[PDB]
Amino acid sequence: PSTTQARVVVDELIRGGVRDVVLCPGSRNAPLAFALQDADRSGRIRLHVRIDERTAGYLAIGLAIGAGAPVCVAMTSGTAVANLGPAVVEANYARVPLIVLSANRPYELLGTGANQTMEQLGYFGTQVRASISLGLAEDAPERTSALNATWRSATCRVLAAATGARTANAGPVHFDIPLRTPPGRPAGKPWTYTPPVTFDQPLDIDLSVDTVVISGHGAGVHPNLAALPTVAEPTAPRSGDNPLHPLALPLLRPQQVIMLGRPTLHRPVSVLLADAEVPVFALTTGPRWPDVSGNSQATGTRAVTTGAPRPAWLDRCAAMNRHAIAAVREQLAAHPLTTGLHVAAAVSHALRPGDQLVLGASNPVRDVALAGLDTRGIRVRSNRGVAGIDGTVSTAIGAALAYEGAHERTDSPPRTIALIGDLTFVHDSSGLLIGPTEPIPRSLTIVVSNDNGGGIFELLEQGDPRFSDVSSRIFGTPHDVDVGALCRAYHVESRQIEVDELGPTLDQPGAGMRVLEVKADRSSLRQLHAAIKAAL
Amino acid sequence: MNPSTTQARVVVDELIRGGVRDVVLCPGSRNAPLAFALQDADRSGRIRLHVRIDERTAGYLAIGLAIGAGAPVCVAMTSGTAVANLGPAVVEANYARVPLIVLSANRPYELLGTGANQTMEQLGYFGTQVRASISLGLAEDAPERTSALNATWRSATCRVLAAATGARTANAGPVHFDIPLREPLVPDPPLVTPPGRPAGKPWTYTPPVTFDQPLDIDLSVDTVVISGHGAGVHPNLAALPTVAEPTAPRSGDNPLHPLALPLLRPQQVIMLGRPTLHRPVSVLLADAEVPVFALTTGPRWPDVSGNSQATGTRAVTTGAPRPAWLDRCAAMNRHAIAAVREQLAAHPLTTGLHVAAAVSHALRPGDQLVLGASNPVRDVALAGLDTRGIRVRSNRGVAGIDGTVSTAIGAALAYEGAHERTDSPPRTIALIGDLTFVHDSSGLLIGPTEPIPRSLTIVVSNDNGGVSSRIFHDVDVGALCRAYHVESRQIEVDELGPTLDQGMRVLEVKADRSSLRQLHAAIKAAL
Amino acid sequence: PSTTQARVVVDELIRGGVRDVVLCPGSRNAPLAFALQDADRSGRIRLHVRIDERTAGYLAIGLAIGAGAPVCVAMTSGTAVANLGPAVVEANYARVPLIVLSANRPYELLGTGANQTMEQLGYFGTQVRASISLGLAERTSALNATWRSATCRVLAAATGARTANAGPVHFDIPLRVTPPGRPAGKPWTYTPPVTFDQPLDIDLSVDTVVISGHGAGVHPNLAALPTVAEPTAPRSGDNPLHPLALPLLRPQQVIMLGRPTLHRPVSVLLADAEVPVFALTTGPRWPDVSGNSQATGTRAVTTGAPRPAWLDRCAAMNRHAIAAVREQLAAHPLTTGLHVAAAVSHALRPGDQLVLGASNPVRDVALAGLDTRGIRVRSNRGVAGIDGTVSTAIGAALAYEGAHERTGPPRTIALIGDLTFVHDSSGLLIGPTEPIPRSLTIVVSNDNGGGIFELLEQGDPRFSDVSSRIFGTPHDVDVGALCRAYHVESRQIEVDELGPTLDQPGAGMRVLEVKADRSSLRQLHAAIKAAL
Numbered sequence A: 001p002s003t004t005q006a007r008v009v010v011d012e013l014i015r016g017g018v019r020d021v022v023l024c025p026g027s028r029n030a031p032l033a034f035a036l037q038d039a040d041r042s043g044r045i046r047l048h049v050r051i052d053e054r055t056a057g058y059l060a061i062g063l064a065i066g067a068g069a070p071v072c073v074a075m076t077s078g079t080a081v082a083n084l085g086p087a088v089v090e091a092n093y094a095r096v097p098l099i100v101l102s103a104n105r106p107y108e109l110l111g112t113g114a115n116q117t118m119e120q121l122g123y124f125g126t127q128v129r130a131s132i133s134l135g136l137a138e139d140a141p142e143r144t145s146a147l148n149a150t151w152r153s154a155t156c157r158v159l160a161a162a163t164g165a166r167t168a169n170a171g172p173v174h175f176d177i178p179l180r181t182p183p184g185r186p187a188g189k190p191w192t193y194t195p196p197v198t199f200d201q202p203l204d205i206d207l208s209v210d211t212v213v214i215s216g217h218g219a220g221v222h223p224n225l226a227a228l229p230t231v232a233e234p235t236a237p238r239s240g241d242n243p244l245h246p247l248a249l250p251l252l253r254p255q256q257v258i259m260l261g262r263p264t265l266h267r268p269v270s271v272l273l274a275d276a277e278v279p280v281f282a283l284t285t286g287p288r289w290p291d292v293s294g295n296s297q298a299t300g301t302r303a304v305t306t307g308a309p310r311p312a313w314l315d316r317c318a319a320m321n322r323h324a325i326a327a328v329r330e331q332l333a334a335h336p337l338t339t340g341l342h343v344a345a346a347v348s349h350a351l352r353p354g355d356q357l358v359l360g361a362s363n364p365v366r367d368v369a370l371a372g373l374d375t376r377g378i379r380v381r382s383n384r385g386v387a388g389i390d391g392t393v394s395t396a397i398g399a400a401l402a403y404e405g406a407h408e409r410t411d412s413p414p415r416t417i418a419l420i421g422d423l424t425f426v427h428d429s430s431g432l433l434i435g436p437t438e439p440i441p442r443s444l445t446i447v448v449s450n451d452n453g454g455g456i457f458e459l460l461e462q463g464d465p466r467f468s469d470v471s472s473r474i475f476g477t478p479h480d481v482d483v484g485a486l487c488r489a490y491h492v493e494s495r496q497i498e499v500d501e502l503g504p505t506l507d508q509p510g511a512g513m514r515v516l517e518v519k520a521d522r523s524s525l526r527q528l529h530a531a532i533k534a535a536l
Numbered sequence B: 001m002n003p004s005t006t007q008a009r010v011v012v013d014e015l016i017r018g019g020v021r022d023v024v025l026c027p028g029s030r031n032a033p034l035a036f037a038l039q040d041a042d043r044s045g046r047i048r049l050h051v052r053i054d055e056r057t058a059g060y061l062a063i064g065l066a067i068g069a070g071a072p073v074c075v076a077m078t079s080g081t082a083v084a085n086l087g088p089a090v091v092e093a094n095y096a097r098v099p100l101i102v103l104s105a106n107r108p109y110e111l112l113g114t115g116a117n118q119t120m121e122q123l124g125y126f127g128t129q130v131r132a133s134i135s136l137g138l139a140e141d142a143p144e145r146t147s148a149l150n151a152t153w154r155s156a157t158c159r160v161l162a163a164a165t166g167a168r169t170a171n172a173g174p175v176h177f178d179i180p181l182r183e184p185l186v187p188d189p190p191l192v193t194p195p196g197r198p199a200g201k202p203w204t205y206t207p208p209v210t211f212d213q214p215l216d217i218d219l220s221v222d223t224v225v226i227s228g229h230g231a232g233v234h235p236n237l238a239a240l241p242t243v244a245e246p247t248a249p250r251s252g253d254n255p256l257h258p259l260a261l262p263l264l265r266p267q268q269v270i271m272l273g274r275p276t277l278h279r280p281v282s283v284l285l286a287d288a289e290v291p292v293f294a295l296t297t298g299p300r301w302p303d304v305s306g307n308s309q310a311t312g313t314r315a316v317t318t319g320a321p322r323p324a325w326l327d328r329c330a331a332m333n334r335h336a337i338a339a340v341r342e343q344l345a346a347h348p349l350t351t352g353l354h355v356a357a358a359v360s361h362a363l364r365p366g367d368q369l370v371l372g373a374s375n376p377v378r379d380v381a382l383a384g385l386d387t388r389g390i391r392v393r394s395n396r397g398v399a400g401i402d403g404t405v406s407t408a409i410g411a412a413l414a415y416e417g418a419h420e421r422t423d424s425p426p427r428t429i430a431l432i433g434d435l436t437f438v439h440d441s442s443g444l445l446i447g448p449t450e451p452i453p454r455s456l457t458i459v460v461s462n463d464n465g466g467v468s469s470r471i472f473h474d475v476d477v478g479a480l481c482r483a484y485h486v487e488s489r490q491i492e493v494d495e496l497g498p499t500l501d502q503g504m505r506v507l508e509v510k511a512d513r514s515s516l517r518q519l520h521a522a523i524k525a526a527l
Numbered sequence C: 001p002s003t004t005q006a007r008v009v010v011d012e013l014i015r016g017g018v019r020d021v022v023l024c025p026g027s028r029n030a031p032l033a034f035a036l037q038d039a040d041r042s043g044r045i046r047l048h049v050r051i052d053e054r055t056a057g058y059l060a061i062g063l064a065i066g067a068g069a070p071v072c073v074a075m076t077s078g079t080a081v082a083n084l085g086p087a088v089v090e091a092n093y094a095r096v097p098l099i100v101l102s103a104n105r106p107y108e109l110l111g112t113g114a115n116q117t118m119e120q121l122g123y124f125g126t127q128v129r130a131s132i133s134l135g136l137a138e139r140t141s142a143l144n145a146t147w148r149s150a151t152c153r154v155l156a157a158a159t160g161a162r163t164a165n166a167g168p169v170h171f172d173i174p175l176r177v178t179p180p181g182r183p184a185g186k187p188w189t190y191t192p193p194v195t196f197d198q199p200l201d202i203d204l205s206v207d208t209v210v211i212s213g214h215g216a217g218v219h220p221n222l223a224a225l226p227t228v229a230e231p232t233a234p235r236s237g238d239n240p241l242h243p244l245a246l247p248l249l250r251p252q253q254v255i256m257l258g259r260p261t262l263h264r265p266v267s268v269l270l271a272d273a274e275v276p277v278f279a280l281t282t283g284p285r286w287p288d289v290s291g292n293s294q295a296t297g298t299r300a301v302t303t304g305a306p307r308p309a310w311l312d313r314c315a316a317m318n319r320h321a322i323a324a325v326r327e328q329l330a331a332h333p334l335t336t337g338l339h340v341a342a343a344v345s346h347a348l349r350p351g352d353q354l355v356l357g358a359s360n361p362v363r364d365v366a367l368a369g370l371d372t373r374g375i376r377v378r379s380n381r382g383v384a385g386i387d388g389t390v391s392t393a394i395g396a397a398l399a400y401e402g403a404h405e406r407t408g409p410p411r412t413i414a415l416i417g418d419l420t421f422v423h424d425s426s427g428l429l430i431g432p433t434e435p436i437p438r439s440l441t442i443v444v445s446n447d448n449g450g451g452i453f454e455l456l457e458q459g460d461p462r463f464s465d466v467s468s469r470i471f472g473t474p475h476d477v478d479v480g481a482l483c484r485a486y487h488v489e490s491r492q493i494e495v496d497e498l499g500p501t502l503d504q505p506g507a508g509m510r511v512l513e514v515k516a517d518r519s520s521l522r523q524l525h526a527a528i529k530a531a532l
């Protein structure tokens, strides 16, 4: 009955490329729970069990962005929708193939004097690419074949919407399997096959006009833009090797901007993208496109270029790039205290091709860009879809698990190194709790630049000295957490170290999961950035 | 100029730059800034304004102006139930992939919850039916912010346009564009609108996109093509026998009658678009014995009742159909349509099928045909209409009866406008059942100030009919036509063809429902 | 088993007071269709079938406000949700107990590449008081209890039985000798009279005016006060204040009853920060204009009494406003909607049901000074649409006549504009199988366009060149031929004889058309103000 339907869906889901599913024990039995257990023992799919439904959703995001696979999470309780909300919104904005699995009871009253099987909020209506319900399995062995095809093709429709197999717009899907082995295609092929879909929108750009590339989250690779000065966010794949340090951009006067993906960092980027005297061309990989103050002049997916940049423009930007990273390095050297920017510069020098970098929001993701990281050869992950400081520990854990599993399918597994701030760490500290029955990454290291509060607020307008009396409680928000004791409580190896130890410590493989705490200072963060501006 | 006027003129100016050539408008006080702006563009000849009274049928008018020429069409109305009345047209525009922009005026959102007159939860009313629901935001009284506001208003408008036309998604559909407006709502007694791009370019240019998904298919396997609503043109599929719905564009010269399909044994079928029509088409699709390849123009693809091997946008073909297979389908096609034409002539009295055959015999290349989504689209398909060189429209999105008359009027008007931008205008002939005509009879209503189609003939085949089924009317079609001042002459099926050679008129042809069961059974037995 | 379930649910709806259910032919069978057919055959319930789903929704509105009973309408097609939307919005805002019946299918695909059983829009989540689904059908005595309690739940939410906020409810009954209910016809779960009490201390010595709007309650302790009552407000006293007199007075505080929506002077005062406004409503919601309402309640505990001079000043402006309207209507040659409204107002006798369309009609009746005492006045003031007014009158006539018939046939007179009439013209077609009112007269004041815009800013003569096409919207519809096409009795008369025509009974349904002028509306109203 349901059991055959259950095994059919899981089989099709595996054929569709799902390799990881995330579960939490709930009052109701999970949708497909027994079928997933069977598949997990046989080695066809990998289960991850958590108690915290919120960190479990972010765990599923990590398992998806770690290697690009669609990931399932099976809701189990009345609080699951509420707890999965944040990760679903992130999956929508960051275009992450996340399949949320539900199980409705159609023989039960709905909307009356009882808690509902699925406590429904409003976000499913606005966040998901599809909400598909399979419909009740029926006792009909005469029609066994007809239901097999109906179940499997619908599962392919779920996967198609999840991975953007026809829309070029991956994102979350709500897959419902209500509650009261037929074979798939031969050679393991999916039931309904959707080929690679190319979505193409050419755009004429004249490269002789002084041009800068600004690539952000979700940017595509563009070989014909490789030589242009490029301000690339850390999660943006780089097409060339002519980088433009973000602090150098406000000291230049570009006449034309090619904008790749969705930029979210640096105030001078916002100022330039909003400049009515500067044409801005949005090149994206999906149907969506962003704008700053309504200044995007055209949208497309690839450039058709004529002309070539004037060598004086390239030399002027190249000299501005060298000037910018020099001021950063020089005044970090002349700065007596350790700041998060110091920490980010140390992590940047320690990484090597093949690593995976997972960056928290707030200062870490900006600090790494300011330090001049060369992301070539490195996979950079960061939840830029909504830029939350929640769920980052489990994002790194899932991203490391997925990435290490992909390396396995082909030497020791590649390094996954994470740089997050202290609030970010305390937010998702329950992500460290992993039972001995669950998969744990072999080469994950989490670097926590701990300046005992939110350092990025020392740089905004509320960090101005005229607010010094009142800004500590409501923007600084110190906590005095014993990071080492918290890691001890969760049985994860942890050490507090100084900046010079980071490179050596990271090079020496430790336990599968380790937390490297570096005590940083934000008292002097504003003065440090003011000095970096003054050196420019 | 006050904010509401400035904002409404900027919005209408950008919509014209986006290709809007026709706007349907419904009266109201809250939408006065749009109406004022729209009439000026009408008087300057940038658009054609169409005023209607009934929002619901006005939406299907807008649909017709969209499918007749292929352009985005706005419908603008006041706040409250005026917006709810666009519901039915939005559902049809959703499934039919029609670029219908619902341009609603609204009270300031700050009044929602105060009990203000005619103030409801507008934003989001249409839910998932629309491609997007976009609120422009209340216009600030800020003269120094004007240029900035111009950039954001225009950019929002092009987002509305892009979602509605599928400029980047390849999935055209309806879009809700809500505009909160505040007093003053009429232009001030100040005698320049913030400018858009030079040379009439759109604020955010987005070139039409290419969405490609190639599919390996082997034509040596005995194949039949089934092409439904929204199907595309496939030259490498032109030689194969094709069962094509009336609104599906023909790719070749090898037709297959729908009655002939269930008497043949195809080994694979290529499905084009979304087959909505034939009952035998669906019975063969719901068969795991025969593989199905779905070729669509956009991201959507139909539930095949299972057993769809693959979906794509185009075929890459190896091999060629068996000559024997071609001869067999071609024989059965002749046999099926010969059985229809012979039983028709043998039937003593004129039926709905006879009227449909007479219409098809009278069409000629260049004509536009609008069919009611019930029996007319089936009857014409049974008569074997060669839709090549003909534009065939029908609201096959949900196949409702709402707005069928207005859709025909909208399609004629938009079709004629396209011809006008290049001798005498082409003909648009509509075939509507009486119950459908009775239902949307108020869709005939065109105020004396508004455009009437130049060459539109609505053919009503009246058979006085098709626990709720107990209502199945004897409603005078002529009297209805006088009530909305439309010339109507009742005729017979033999005068139809000659008559159609002769502005907007209705030709009622009295038909019989008594003998179709006998007629249809006679066709089944002749196969 | 679903047959038993439907019979149980239909039976519980009868016991819950449902007397009328509206149906539409659609792609699949309606929910409860057979059990509803048996109830209609046996006379326990009255079915009304229409083709137009939108007019069928408003028919249910009429059948609900005509006598206060909960009314069901059963969706049967894909476009049903979309076509029912306008009525459901009105039912939410006007607090009308509308039960929308759905029959979802749990054994079928949902959300896939196919047309859906229900094409869902976004409004159900914003408008309805509840969404209850029964769940698919040896345990028959327990299932009977679950089904009947759930059905009472639906009824309670729709009638505001525990919330005091009646409104629309979505009731889903899934599908792939009948168990009795409580004895003596009692409902399964009894919810007794609920009283939501919220007293407000108001000093009546302060110069006070009362403004009452839609849904206003009756306050015997406010009878003596001057009252600017909207037509659909039940009057508690005998001291009216004409709305045009309001700007000639200086009230010091205002008691606002229900939800007012008419007259700019009412809005201007309700927003005056120097005027305390107390909102007395019958339900949990309360209105505000510009956030000026100082307090809310359900009733007033009063201290003091109005000043004798205040009563006299209000009464004098009241007479002056009545004199201004009556006199200027006499010195105006052409006939307008305001003349037609006055003639209707004088033809009404106690026991009548007056149904007023939006636009000028419901305003003109207020300006004509109609005493609503003894009259049952209906108007779709929830959203003030001009849609669905014909079927609203028809359903209200049917429910009102059915109330009287069960007592041992009062008149329903409708006054609507021409645009309003053309909007819901499809409501005139009723099959011979379907209930038809016996004493419904629809007066159509036809000035070939929307006369209300002649009275607004867009009616200023500076827009005379452009106003007619986009605000007037003339249509030249032959109203006579329209009613003829639907086999509806209709005559076209002058206003001189509309009075007498309404005095002599006619066919069960009849349309009286009075040709009107709107090119002189702005001058007429300007003269009324100049005569004030």
Ligand SMILES: Cc1ncc(C[n+]2csc(CCOP(=O)(O)OP(=O)(O)O)c2C)c(N)n1
Pocket: A340, A361, A362, A363, A364, A387, A388, A389, A390, A420, A421, A422, A423, A424, A425, A449, A451, A453, A454, A455, A456, A457
């Ligand atoms: C879920 C969530 N809550 C609150 C915020 C607001 N916020 C943005 S950055 C930030 C400071 C983060 O502190 P930390 O992790 O210590 O980073 P650093 O101090 O290194 O900047 C906060 C609270 C957010 N982005 N996401």
Ligand SMILES: Cc1ncc(C[n+]2csc(CCOP(=O)(O)OP(=O)(O)O)c2C)c(N)n1
Pocket: B027, B028, B029, B055, B078, B081, B082, B085, C337, C357, C358, C359, C360, C361, C384, C385, C386, C387, C416, C417, C418, C419, C420, C421, C445, C447, C449, C450, C451, C452, C453
């Ligand atoms: C469904 C709907 N659409 C549009 C409007 C806007 N509107 C308000 S009054 C009016 C004119 C009504 O015309 P008519 O029925 O002739 O009344 P008159 O003012 O001429 O008496 C319009 C179009 C509305 N209230 N409801």
Ligand SMILES: O=C(O)c1cc(O)c2ccccc2c1O
Pocket: A092, A093, A094, A095, A217, A218, A261, A262, A284, A285, A286, A288, A289, A290, A291, A385
């Ligand atoms: O390019 C992307 O990946 C991307 C992702 C998004 O979530 C967006 C949301 C709004 C607007 C533009 C977006 C966008 O361009």
Ligand SMILES: O=C(O)c1cc(O)c2ccccc2c1O
Pocket: B094, B095, B096, B097, B229, B230, B231, B273, B274, B296, B297, B298, B300, B301, B302, B303, C112, C113, C114, C115
């Ligand atoms: O190809 C099309 O045009 C088309 C359009 C649609 O609205 C569909 C809706 C559901 C399922 C398939 C669909 C489809 O194939």
Ligand SMILES: O=C(O)c1cc(O)c2ccccc2c1O
Pocket: B113, B114, B115, B116, C092, C093, C094, C095, C214, C215, C216, C258, C259, C281, C282, C283, C285, C286, C287
């Ligand atoms: O009293 C009523 O009948 C009533 C009805 C409504 O629909 C309201 C909506 C918003 C705010 C107040 C409201 C109100 O006071």
Ligand SMILES: [Mg+2]
Pocket: A421, A422, A423, A449, A450, A451, A452, A453, A454, A455
């Ligand atoms: Mg910090």
Ligand SMILES: [Mg+2]
Pocket: C417, C418, C419, C445, C446, C447, C448, C449, C450, C451
């Ligand atoms: Mg009028």
